Amino acid sequence: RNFNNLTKGLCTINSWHIYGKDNAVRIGESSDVLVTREPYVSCDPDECRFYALSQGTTIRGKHSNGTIHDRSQYRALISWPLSSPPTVYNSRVECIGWSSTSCHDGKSRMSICISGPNNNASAVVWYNRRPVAEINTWARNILRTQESECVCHNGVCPVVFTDGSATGPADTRIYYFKEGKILKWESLTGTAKHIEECSCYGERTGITCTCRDNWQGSNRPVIQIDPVAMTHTSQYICSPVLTDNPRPNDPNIGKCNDPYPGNNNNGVKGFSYLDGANTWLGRTISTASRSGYEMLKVPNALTDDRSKPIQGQTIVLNADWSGYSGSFMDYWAEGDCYRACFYVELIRGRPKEDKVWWTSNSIVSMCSSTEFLGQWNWPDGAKIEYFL
Amino acid sequence: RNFNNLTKGLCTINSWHIYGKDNAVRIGESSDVLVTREPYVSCDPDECRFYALSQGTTIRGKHSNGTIHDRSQYRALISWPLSSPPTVYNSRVECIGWSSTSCHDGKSRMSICISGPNNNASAVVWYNRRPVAEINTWARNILRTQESECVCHNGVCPVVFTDGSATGPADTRIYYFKEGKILKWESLTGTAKHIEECSCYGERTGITCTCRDNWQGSNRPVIQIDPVAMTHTSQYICSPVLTDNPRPNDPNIGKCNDPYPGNNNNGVKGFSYLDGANTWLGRTISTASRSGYEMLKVPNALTDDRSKPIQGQTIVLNADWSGYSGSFMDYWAEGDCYRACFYVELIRGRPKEDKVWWTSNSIVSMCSSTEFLGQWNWPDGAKIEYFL
Amino acid sequence: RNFNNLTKGLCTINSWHIYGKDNAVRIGESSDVLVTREPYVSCDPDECRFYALSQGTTIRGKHSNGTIHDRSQYRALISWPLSSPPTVYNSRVECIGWSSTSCHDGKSRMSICISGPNNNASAVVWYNRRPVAEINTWARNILRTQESECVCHNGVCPVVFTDGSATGPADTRIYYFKEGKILKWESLTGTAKHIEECSCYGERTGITCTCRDNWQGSNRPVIQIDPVAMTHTSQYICSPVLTDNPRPNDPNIGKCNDPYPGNNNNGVKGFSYLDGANTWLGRTISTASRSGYEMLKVPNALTDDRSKPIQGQTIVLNADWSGYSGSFMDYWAEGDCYRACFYVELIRGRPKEDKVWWTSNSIVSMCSSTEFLGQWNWPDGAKIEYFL
Amino acid sequence: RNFNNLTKGLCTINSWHIYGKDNAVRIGESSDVLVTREPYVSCDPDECRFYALSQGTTIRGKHSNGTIHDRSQYRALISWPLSSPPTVYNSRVECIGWSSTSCHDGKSRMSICISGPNNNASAVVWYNRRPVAEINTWARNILRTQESECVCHNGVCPVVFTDGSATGPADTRIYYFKEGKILKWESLTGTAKHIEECSCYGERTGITCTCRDNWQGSNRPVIQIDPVAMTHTSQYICSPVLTDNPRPNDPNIGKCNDPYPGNNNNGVKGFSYLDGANTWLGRTISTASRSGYEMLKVPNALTDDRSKPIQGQTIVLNADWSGYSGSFMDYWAEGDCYRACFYVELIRGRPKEDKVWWTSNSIVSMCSSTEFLGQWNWPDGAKIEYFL
Ligand SMILES: *[C@@H]1O[C@H](CO)[C@@H](O[C@@H]2O[C@H](CO)[C@@H](O[C@@H]3O[C@H](CO[C@H]4O[C@H](CO[C@H]5O[C@H](CO)[C@@H](O)[C@H](O)[C@@H]5O)[C@@H](O)[C@H](O[C@H]5O[C@H](CO)[C@@H](O)[C@H](O)[C@@H]5O)[C@@H]4O)[C@@H](O)[C@H](O[C@H]4O[C@H](CO)[C@@H](O)[C@H](O)[C@@H]4O[C@H]4O[C@H](CO)[C@@H](O)[C@H](O)[C@@H]4O[C@H]4O[C@H](CO)[C@@H](O)[C@H](O)[C@@H]4O)[C@@H]3O)[C@H](O)[C@H]2NC(C)=O)[C@H](O)[C@H]1NC(C)=O
Ligand SMILES: *[C@@H]1O[C@H](CO)[C@@H](O[C@@H]2O[C@H](CO)[C@@H](O[C@@H]3O[C@H](CO[C@H]4O[C@H](CO[C@H]5O[C@H](CO)[C@@H](O)[C@H](O)[C@@H]5O)[C@@H](O)[C@H](O[C@H]5O[C@H](CO)[C@@H](O)[C@H](O)[C@@H]5O)[C@@H]4O)[C@@H](O)[C@H](O[C@H]4O[C@H](CO)[C@@H](O)[C@H](O)[C@@H]4O[C@H]4O[C@H](CO)[C@@H](O)[C@H](O)[C@@H]4O[C@H]4O[C@H](CO)[C@@H](O)[C@H](O)[C@@H]4O)[C@@H]3O)[C@H](O)[C@H]2NC(C)=O)[C@H](O)[C@H]1NC(C)=O
Ligand SMILES: *[C@@H]1O[C@H](CO)[C@@H](O[C@@H]2O[C@H](CO)[C@@H](O[C@@H]3O[C@H](CO[C@H]4O[C@H](CO[C@H]5O[C@H](CO)[C@@H](O)[C@H](O)[C@@H]5O)[C@@H](O)[C@H](O[C@H]5O[C@H](CO)[C@@H](O)[C@H](O)[C@@H]5O)[C@@H]4O)[C@@H](O)[C@H](O[C@H]4O[C@H](CO)[C@@H](O)[C@H](O)[C@@H]4O[C@H]4O[C@H](CO)[C@@H](O)[C@H](O)[C@@H]4O[C@H]4O[C@H](CO)[C@@H](O)[C@H](O)[C@@H]4O)[C@@H]3O)[C@H](O)[C@H]2NC(C)=O)[C@H](O)[C@H]1NC(C)=O
Ligand SMILES: *[C@@H]1O[C@H](CO)[C@@H](O[C@@H]2O[C@H](CO)[C@@H](O[C@@H]3O[C@H](CO[C@H]4O[C@H](CO[C@H]5O[C@H](CO)[C@@H](O)[C@H](O)[C@@H]5O)[C@@H](O)[C@H](O[C@H]5O[C@H](CO)[C@@H](O)[C@H](O)[C@@H]5O)[C@@H]4O)[C@@H](O)[C@H](O[C@H]4O[C@H](CO)[C@@H](O)[C@H](O)[C@@H]4O[C@H]4O[C@H](CO)[C@@H](O)[C@H](O)[C@@H]4O[C@H]4O[C@H](CO)[C@@H](O)[C@H](O)[C@@H]4O)[C@@H]3O)[C@H](O)[C@H]2NC(C)=O)[C@H](O)[C@H]1NC(C)=O
Ligand SMILES: CC(=O)N[C@H]1[C@H]([C@H](O)[C@H](O)CO)O[C@@](O)(C(=O)O)C[C@@H]1O
Ligand SMILES: CC(=O)N[C@H]1[C@H]([C@H](O)[C@H](O)CO)O[C@@](O)(C(=O)O)C[C@@H]1O
Ligand SMILES: CC(=O)N[C@H]1[C@H]([C@H](O)[C@H](O)CO)O[C@@](O)(C(=O)O)C[C@@H]1O
Ligand SMILES: [Ca+2]
Ligand SMILES: [Ca+2]
Ligand SMILES: [Ca+2]
Ligand SMILES: [Ca+2]
């Protein structure tokens, strides 16, 4: 076949419809469902699948004790069929490690997993299910990457990595891969001051990534990548509609080229679709914790430091736990435009529910509609009391 | 490949033979079998599969408590191989929601799932396993559809939807899809006074649907659809052999253009094959509850308001629980005629068996034979005492 | 592709080597393994699979209680990959019923399942996984068939059926199918006096079946079928090496055209390879019960009523339970000859082990070698005490 | 397709990166994971898979009691997807027996399994998933083979077998197969004095095998095979870096043509990559038991009896249990060189952990990198206390 090229724009987003939901924690109460976290979704030309980092144990298994921890030798990137749960028997391992990204270039899939101790981690780049390239840590402090899908154009797939402090200046690099081979890498440029866990999408030969500032910012950094020139810029979302978590209350003036202050040394992976008047931002409803999730239509959020919402949709009630969120699109669907999609990780267990000793999640996913559809809310749906 | 066209008539039906049976509740006593209800069967050109609405839990799982309820965020349309049970590990999710239909047009499969709260539900139309179109509620009162397979002709697949009261006049629409796109919709016309859960089949370029009148009728409404003109008519089955449940005893004169009275605000999904002297009707044996199932040969049942049975076959004894029933056919089989098939849902658990706190079902399915075959009876076969 | 034709002879049989073994009862002690009985093996052009009649429950499931019974609505013909156990999650249902046969003609597979009450049973013939023909009971007394694979030549697949008494004269028919359609049937001719559960193989355009005389005989009946003329003959194995079970001790003169007396109203499915000086017979070691299994090389056993063994191989020790046995061959293997194969059913549970309330089996299978290989013995290997 | 030919050399090995890990014992604490031992890895042109000898029971099953034993009728060679665990539901049986090897020749896979009692064992050779040839024991004392993958060149696949004493001179043969047929065999020649469990790889039309001397040696024997001439030589690794287990401490002079003494009648399967200055040896860290695992870069280890390490990498800490290790490569990967890979068996249970009554393992696997990557350590990760 052929390399996918980003020739289309985004479809007009007037609401969001349910796309996938795996009910993993409900089902895992009485089935062999793997403990996971950091999920995402990624499409092949002939299939869309769920992805996540396994913890190498089932939820009901005794080894689920202690799975609040992020990095171990027992983690792996797995994938499984859309809206099924991640089971021992239906999950496919993509590579071994505790930080990942993955994407299809139209011909084959690239998957990247990072493993190792904090001071000696390394990335292995797989292409067509074979290891092709390796990258050693350059700052010796938890080499880490996107935790959602990358995007490819004409065979070139950019990936954002960070190595260094989670609470001060770090060393972020953008790598450009083709068939798993390193074409080029560059150090981060622009005005973003701290970058983690970028969520990306592609449109009209440009790639846009919305990231997490874990140091001083509660507005989100944005990286804009030209996959042909293999260059990038960075800044923050200018809008005063702040979308990190935890975060201050929304002001009336945002910040384009610096972190908006109030909350230090924390954050959550999130995403946005930045498309002029067709702009939608995702965020937790709570400003204090990872609970609730909503989409807000915020015209020109990227560039207008006074911009406010004109429409919205609740995805997860504030009474229910959320978690990481990220972007993906089916680049191989029919039609003249790409349909914006996203997922929300619904974290259950520790630290917020400490009557159990495990941490896991389920997944809900939505795609955009040109209709103005009615909204529901989409909780994980499991009862903690059943696990006691 | 090519779009299927409805070029054949029905085979002569002289008896029914066993086609499929999944023994799901028996097997689920000690395996990871999903709780379901509203099952059906649908064929692809190369495979026939079972379908149902999952409840997002296994039977032995503690989340099975409360599954008598019809609409939740944890339901999804799943499919799995013919006569296997619906397990966590072998079930494929088609889309998310609590009311569905699905059919193959010869090239790809269309699946439709409705989700949302009662006053804000929406349908998402999937084609070739991608979302293609969306339809918002128009009466804000449980938008709902067939719960068995649709039928396609030359790429055009009609689907019947209802939105509005279950106990008074409602707003029924027939939608005509092609490759998941809306070609046209029309409001219900004809003399049917209330329409729910249509069971359809196709023959000689016409589609016939047998539905449920939940308001005042215990005779079944019939919709006849011309998929080329994209028009329809409606009436009731004229025969005094009444086939809803619950229902009055059979009179000697039926009603062609109005509900036959006696039982209000209830019913069950059912089906018929209306083919002149080759006409067969399905119904529960009990007039009071969903127990037993039988087929009756009732010549010209559609148009003769004096017609009575001349032959029959018991499928499920009155001593055993039944449930929904519906039609399907293998439009891709060999031969000069289409073989009529049907399924019966065998409901176990609540409300009729309240020693357990769950509701689920298994499936039995039959197809027609030109032979005069001996009959058996086909119970679910599970013992409730084992689940206590 | 093309219809297989029987153009080769049997390979020289100098010993037997292990082919497959599924350890089903061992594994089912702690996994979701279906209760089965009446297993066999059958090859497709690209795969060989195990087959059996499921009982619609797992071994550890509470519905395993009572599975000594042979005929129920919860039985089905299933198949699963060679040497795996029959699990809920890996088994494919071929058709519904409690007596079966199945074979591949080179293009597609035909499967036949019989279901119904004792006085009203019927066979459904499936071809390319669709129902094609049906056959009603003709003697109203447990219509029944081979319980191992049929054999095809140039698209024509003969199958032996019996309807009527298990303890007196019955009505046996040979049906000739092509693409699931009935070409012809004939009533049994020749000198066999009672026929059940034929085990067949094909070579040089002839099909040979070794059957079970359940009435008066402890020598086995043989049916020889010409699939081109669609005619047959029948007799008994002439050898005094008797191979039914239970049976008298071996005399020095056998019987060619009548039952050898001593044991009435019982038997077991078995097989032989009748090939002049290359003749091998299978039998239980015990004359009283289904325990042990051995192969004996008995030159001209079919026609020589004085013939005795000149070589042998123990398959299952007399200290271990056996059961049904039958023939199959890979008609699509490389080489100038067909390699003779067989399976032995290893029955565990009731009636011989009544500390449990279930009956199931595992499978061992062997194929012939031109080498003189060392022998092992191949028990089921499960410990009944573990199931208590 | 075409037979693979060994046209490439080894890639430069500057470090090792994680390739696969199945966490089988962790996951098997609460899932239907088969008990195994003697694992390995082998690639097809389109897939790489894990292999092992099953014990015909799950870990949590009661039949796991006694699985320290090596040879039983319930063992089989199974394969399953890379980095998944070996489950009842995802494992494919290749053949039946208790000693094995397997390899793909570019067109189809050959698998060999040995079964039988100690004095009457036999090998069955499968090709394209059909039995093709058989080999009877020639010394009547546990006929046995490699327990890791063989290597093919232009359709010819050499395999090393041993029959005879484990504690004195034995009869080793090299067999040369093509499409499962025996082309030739030869008796072992050269200076190796005892050969078991060879680990092989291929490069530039030569095959190199590193074996186990179980009699008097703690240096490893090496067999070098010319698959075109179908001839071989043998010797020992000359280096004083000793790599058997148990073993003496490293001297300063090794032995090229005789066993290095100190430890009798024991050993462990292991491997090396012998490639001049690109030479790397694997070994346990402990000299006394199967604990820890490390790679050492030992230039010209094969031929230099003074050679010492100049670089290394720890794979498994000495505090953690290891086991067998072996070589494999993806002969169908892209690039101008073959990437060296290996696996380490991580044995859990008896004899070292006798609070449980079973013996099983998990797998870790690495491949070489031209980068100098940071190292981690890779334990099995299961807690024995959870199994009590
Ligand atoms: C069936 O389903 C449908 C479809 O889902 C349901 O309809 C949906 O209903 C929801 C809920 O109401 C709507 O979401 C909200 O949308 C509003 C925005 O819409 C309003 O404002 C628009 C802009 O108005 C301004 O500009 C125009 C210029 O043209 C000017 O005219 C106007 O005066 C004003 O200057 C209006 O255009 C718009 O009107 C239109 O739409 C109406 C329908 O909604 C319609 O009736 C009209 O005729 C017209 O067509 C409308 O008035 C969002 O503002 C809102 O989001 C805020 O509120 C939620 C809480 O509900 C909160 O979670 C959000 O985060 C946000 O509030 C926070 O952020 C603000 C920005 O900083 C801040 O100002 C707030 O104080 C608040 O901040 C606090 O909370 C946050 C979060 O914790 C925290 O971080 C902060 O620090 C701080 O603590 C909702 O998104 C959908 O748009 C609507 N969809 C459709 C298609 O109608 C329907 O209800 C369902 N039916 C039933 C029966 O259930
Ligand atoms: C082996 O297997 C075979 C194959 O399955 C078995 O054979 C089958 O046996 C079953 C059971 O008997 C049969 O089903 C019944 O069929 C009859 C219809 O057939 C009869 O009537 C025909 C029509 O007669 C009328 O017209 C002709 C004009 O030509 C005229 O001559 C005649 O005088 C009369 O005017 C006859 O043609 C037919 O004869 C033929 O067939 C005979 C074999 O059956 C054969 O012997 C003859 O020689 C001839 O060839 C035959 O007489 C159905 O009426 C019946 O269904 C009613 O009864 C069941 C209870 O059994 C009930 O559940 C049904 O719902 C229905 O009864 C309700 O509805 C009626 C309609 O409103 C109503 O009038 C009733 O009062 C009753 O209503 C009550 O109950 C319902 C349900 O709860 C409730 O809703 C109401 O409100 C009310 O409370 C059966 O379907 C098969 O047809 C037959 N198949 C074959 C191929 O033979 C065989 O038995 C097995 N063997 C063994 C050993 O087990
Ligand atoms: C490693 O593995 C190898 C390979 O598996 C093992 O070698 C195998 O060993 C087994 C066990 O011994 C052998 O099976 C037996 O074979 C004999 C037949 O072979 C003997 O007889 C041949 C025929 O002799 C006659 O004809 C020739 C004419 O040429 C004439 O010369 C001769 O005098 C006589 O007239 C001989 O040719 C043959 O010799 C050859 O082979 C020898 C090796 O075996 C070799 O040493 C010689 O040099 C020569 O090459 C040999 O003498 C079968 O008879 C026997 O089966 C009977 O016995 C078993 C019990 O063991 C029983 O279960 C069978 O059912 C059968 O006995 C019953 O049926 C008879 C027939 O009616 C009846 O007469 C009996 O009384 C008995 O009946 C009772 O029991 C049954 C069953 O319950 C019941 O139904 C009845 O009613 C009644 O109660 C075995 O099959 C293999 O052939 C042999 N294979 C090879 C390749 O060598 C080796 O042992 C292993 N190594 C180790 C260390 O373990
Ligand atoms: C992040 O990750 C990176 C990458 O993994 C980590 O860096 C790695 O660190 C490990 C651990 O230190 C290294 O492994 C060791 O390598 C040494 C070999 O390297 C040394 O020696 C080289 C050769 O020196 C000789 O020749 C040169 C000629 O050119 C001459 O100049 C020199 O004087 C001497 O004559 C040196 O070239 C080399 O220097 C280079 O590398 C340095 C970095 O390592 C660098 O700083 C230098 O500038 C230069 O570039 C270096 O000095 C192995 O010797 C060693 O293996 C031994 O020790 C381990 C224990 O640690 C033991 O398990 C091994 O089995 C082995 O020791 C046994 O065997 C010996 C051979 O018989 C014997 O002599 C020993 O006594 C011992 O024997 C006992 O134990 C065994 C086992 O139980 C038993 O069987 C015996 O009987 C007996 O009881 C390690 O393999 C990696 O090479 C290194 N990799 C890289 C790329 O740097 C980094 O640490 C991580 N970072 C953090 C923060 O964690
Ligand atoms: C490689 C790694 O440890 N990633 C972890 C990151 C980093 O800690 C932060 O991004 C700070 O760098 O955040 C999590 O803890 C979190 O917030 O839920 C989860 C994730 O596993
Ligand atoms: C969308 C929805 O709720 N469908 C439900 C329907 C409606 O209640 C009725 O058709 C009245 O409209 O009927 C059921 O309750 C029933 O009778 O078993 C099941 C089904 O799930
Ligand atoms: C259709 C049917 O019932 N087949 C059964 C047959 C018949 O009873 C006999 O062949 C007599 O006809 O034999 C069995 O009981 C048996 O011997 O183990 C098993 C089998 O299920
Ligand atoms: Ca932050
Ligand atoms: Ca009604
Ligand atoms: Ca008999
Ligand atoms: Ca040794």
Distances (CA, A) of B70 to B36, B54, B284, B384, C89: 10, 10, 21, 22, 27
CA gap D16, D18 in Å, rounded:
7
Top CATH class of C1-388 equals mainly beta
Would the CA dihedral through C24, C25, C28, C29 be positive or negative?
negative
CA gap A193, B191 in Å, rounded:
69
CA gap C225, B192 in Å, rounded:
60
CA angle in degrees (0–180, nearest 5) for D110-D115-D118 = 140
Residue B316: which of B289, B349, B294 has the closest Cα?
B294
Query: Under an 8 A CB cutoff, do B130 and A330 touch?
Result: yes
Ligand 10 centroid – CA C297 distance (Å): 22
CA gap C345, C340 in Å, rounded:
17
Helix (H) or strand (E) holding A135, with range, is strand A130-136
SS3 C62: helix
Ligand 6 centroid – CA B70 distance (Å): 7
Cβ pair B134, B143 in contact under 8 A: no
Which protein residue has the closest C-alpha to ligand 7 atom 12? C166
Q: Tell me which of D12, D17, D341 to substitute to probe the interface with A (most A C-beta atoms closer than 10 Å).
A: D17
Residue C84: which of C38, C40, C22 has the closest Cα?
C22
Ligand 7 centroid – CA C267 distance (Å): 9
Ligand 11 centroid – CA D196 distance (Å): 10
Which chains does chain A touch, 3 or more C-beta pairs < 8 A?
Answer: B, D
CA gap A2, A12 in Å, rounded:
27
Q: Which of D40, D260, D273, D324 is catalytic?
A: D324
Residue whose structure tokens are 């993993």: A24
B11-22 burial, b at 16+ Cβ within 10 Å, e below that, comes to bebbbbbbbbbb
User: Pairing mode, if any, of strands B130-136 and B122-127?
Assistant: antiparallel
Which protein residue has the closest C-alpha to ligand 6 atom 2? B70
CA gap D371, D375 in Å, rounded:
12
What residues are paired with A203 via a beta bridge?
A: A206
Helix (H) or strand (E) holding D24, with range, is helix D24-28
Write out the catalytic residue numbers of B.
70, 324
Please count the other Cβ atoms lying within 10 Å of the Cβ belonging to residue A385. Answer: 9
Distances (CA, A) of A369 to A19, A129, A378, B143, B176: 11, 34, 17, 18, 20
Closest-CA distance of chain B to residue C88, Å: 8
SS3 C167: coil
Write out the catalytic residue numbers of C.
70, 324
Contacts of C84 in chain D (CB under 8 A): 88, 91-93
SS3 C278: helix
Contacts of B383 in chain C (CB under 8 A): 62-63
Q: At how many Å resolution was this determined?
A: 1.8
Beta-carbon contacts of residue B328 (< 8 Å; ≥ 6 apart): B40, B41, B42, B43, B148, B149, B201, B341, B342, B343
Contacts of B90 in chain C (CB under 8 A): 89
Closest-CA distance of chain B to residue C115, Å: 8
Contacts of C131 in chain B (CB under 8 A): 17, 19, 339, 367
Cβ pair A84, D50 in contact under 8 A: no
| D324 has catalytic annotation | yes
Beta-carbon contacts of residue A229 (< 8 Å; ≥ 6 apart): none
Contacts of A129 in chain D (CB under 8 A): 47-48
**How would you write chain B as a 3-class SS string?**
CCCCCCCCEECCCCEEEEEEECCHHHHHCCCCEEEEEEEEEEEECCEEEEEEEEEEEECCCHHHCCCCCCCCCCCEEEEEECCCCCECCCCEEEEECCEEEEEECCCCEEEEEEECCCCCCEEEEEECCEEEEEEECCCCCCCECCCCCCCCECCEEEEEEEEECCCCCEEEEEEEEECCEEEEEEECCCCCCCCEEEEEEEECCEEEEEEECCCCCCCCEEEEEECCCCEEEEEECCCCCCCCCCCCCCCCCCCCCCCCCCCCCCCCCCCEECCHHHCEEEECCCCCCCEEEEEEECCCCCCCCCCCCCEEEEEEEEEEECCCEEEEECCCCCCCEECEEEEEEEEEECCCCCCCCCEEEEEEEEEEECCCCCCCCCCCCCCHHHHC
Query: Under an 8 A CB cutoff, do B29 and C56 touch?
Result: no
Q: Where are the domains of chain B?
A: 1-388
The beta-carbon neighbor of C18 closest among D34, D96, D120 is D96
Nearest-CA residue of chain B relative to A383? B63
CA gap B176, A109 in Å, rounded:
37
CA gap C263, C269 in Å, rounded:
15
Cα torsion at C50, C100, B47, B197 (round to 10°)?
Answer: -130
Ligand 11 centroid – CA D78 distance (Å): 28
C345 CA to centre of own chain: 9
- Answer whether the bond into residue C351 is a cis peptide, omega within 30°: yes
**Token couple for B336:** 């000069």
SS3 A60: coil
Nearest-CA residue of chain B relative to A30? B61
Which atom of ligand 4 is found nearest the CA of D375?
5
**CA diameter of chain B:** 55
Nearest-CA residue of chain B relative to C124? B17
Would the CA dihedral through B26, B32, B36, B41 be positive or negative?
negative
CA gap C174, C232 in Å, rounded:
8
Cβ pair A246, A263 in contact under 8 A: yes
In single-letter form, the type of residue at position C233 comes to T
Which protein residue has the closest C-alpha to ligand 7 atom 21? C70
Beta-carbon contacts of residue B82 (< 8 Å; ≥ 6 apart): B20, B41, B47, B48, B49, B50, C93
Q: Is B166 in the pocket of ligand 6 (CB under 6 A)?
A: yes
Which protein residue has the closest C-alpha to ligand 6 atom 7? B166
Cβ pair C201, C268 in contact under 8 A: no
Residue whose structure tokens are 């052009």: C45
In single-letter form, the type of residue at position C343 comes to Y
Beta-carbon contacts of residue A57 (< 8 Å; ≥ 6 apart): A34, A35, A63, A64, A67, A74, D23, D26, D27, D29, D30
Closest-CA distance of chain B to residue A84, Å: 7
| Residue C279 per-residue DSSP state | -
Closest-CA distance of chain A to residue B78, Å: 10
The beta-carbon neighbor of A87 closest among B89, B93, B134 is B89
Query: Under an 8 A CB cutoff, do B20 and C93 touch?
Result: yes
Residue A322: which of A356, A357, A355, A295 has the closest Cα?
A295
Query: Which DSSP string do the residues of A218-273 spell out, in sequence order?
Result: SSPEEEEEETTTTEEEEEE--SSS--SSS-PPP-SS--SSSPPPS--S------EE
**Token couple for D362:** 């998990």
Distances (CA, A) of C280 to C235, C275, C297, C298, C301: 18, 8, 4, 6, 8
**Token couple for D317:** 């800490």
CA gap D189, D210 in Å, rounded:
15
**Token couple for B272:** 């018929």
Helix (H) or strand (E) holding A291, with range, is strand A291-297
Helix (H) or strand (E) holding A9, with range, is strand A9-10
Q: Which residues line ligand 3 (CB under 6 A)?
A: C 241, 249-250, 285, 287, 294, 296, 308-313, 372, 374-375; D 119-120
